[PDB]
Structure 1
Amino acid sequence: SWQSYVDDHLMCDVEGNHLTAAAILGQDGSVWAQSAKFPQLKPQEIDGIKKDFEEPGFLAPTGLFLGGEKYMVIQGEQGAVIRGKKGPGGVTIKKTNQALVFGFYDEPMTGGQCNLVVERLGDYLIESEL
């Protein structure tokens, strides 16, 4: 289920830590499943995310905003993965055929660990035609 993908795939503990919050949204912005602390995103932020996947580098100059919070854009994967940092922590957003997978992390969890959980789920969803 969508909730299981969040609870059991995204929120799994890695090295004793887990994502602060996670969610799988339809590309329309609707929440398919989310964890307890996932922030409400603004329509314009979802629009920005989609434009950045379509035109790599769009958000880079001024930042990736999520829930009104600024994340410094860091190296991503053109049209597939957006990554950002905010203080000790950060986020990974992975695009699938029909959804957007989000993972927010805070130290001691690392960007690499967040990248793994979020991107591996996204890849499974893609192979599952989702």
Structure 2
Amino acid sequence: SWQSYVDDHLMCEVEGNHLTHAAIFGQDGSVWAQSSAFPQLKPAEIAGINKDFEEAGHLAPTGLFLGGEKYMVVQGEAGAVIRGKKGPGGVTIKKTTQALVFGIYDEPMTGGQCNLVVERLGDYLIESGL
């Protein structure tokens, strides 16, 4: 179940903290499963997401946009991870073979605890073909 992947493995608490929002998108833009309040993502936002996984740095100018709200781009894993920052929160976008794993965190959480749950689940999905 894609929903339990969101709830039990992207929204799991680590030291009392959990991601604000989490979602698993198919690379075709379609939501596979998301947290209740995950923002809706404009189709251009997912294109800019996808082209940045091709050759990084496409999103670094202009920044990374998700649901209209902008995140300033920060260092990632080229072709595997996109990371962004907005004040005391940010986002991790881990690309699997078929999907896009999203984690959005706020001020109690760290970028580190975000990359933990996001890139974890992602790396596991790649190993099972997803």
The superposition leaves residues 15-35 of structure 1 with CA deviations (integer Å, 9 ceiling, x where unpaired) of: 111000000000001010000
TM-score (norm 2): 0.99
CA–CA distance in structure 2, aligned partners of residues 23 and 62 of structure 1? 23
The superposition leaves residues 47-70 of structure 1 with CA deviations (integer Å, 9 ceiling, x where unpaired) of: 000000001111112100000111
**1:109-120 counterparts in 2 under 5 A?**
109-120=109-120
Secondary structure (helix, strand or coil) at the match of 1:33 reads strand
Aligned to 1:57: 57
Partner amino acid, structure 2, of 1:99: A
Aligned to 1:29: 29
Aligned to 1:19: 19
* Number of aligned residues: 130
Secondary structure (helix, strand or coil) at the match of 2:56 reads coil
CA–CA distance in structure 2, aligned partners of residues 81 and 24 of structure 1? 14
Aligned to 2:97: 97
> Which structure 2 residue ranges, 5 or more long, are not aligned?
none
Partner amino acid, structure 2, of 1:35: S
Aligned to 1:76: 76
Q: Percent identity?
A: 88
Task: Spell out structure 1 runs of 4+ moving beyond 6 A.
Answer: none
Q: CA RMSD in A?
A: 0.5
Q: Aligned-pair distance for 1:3?
A: 0.3
TM-score (norm 1): 0.99
Aligned to 1:3: 3
> Which structure 1 residue ranges, 5 or more long, are not aligned?
none
CA–CA distance in structure 2, aligned partners of residues 118 and 65 of structure 1? 19
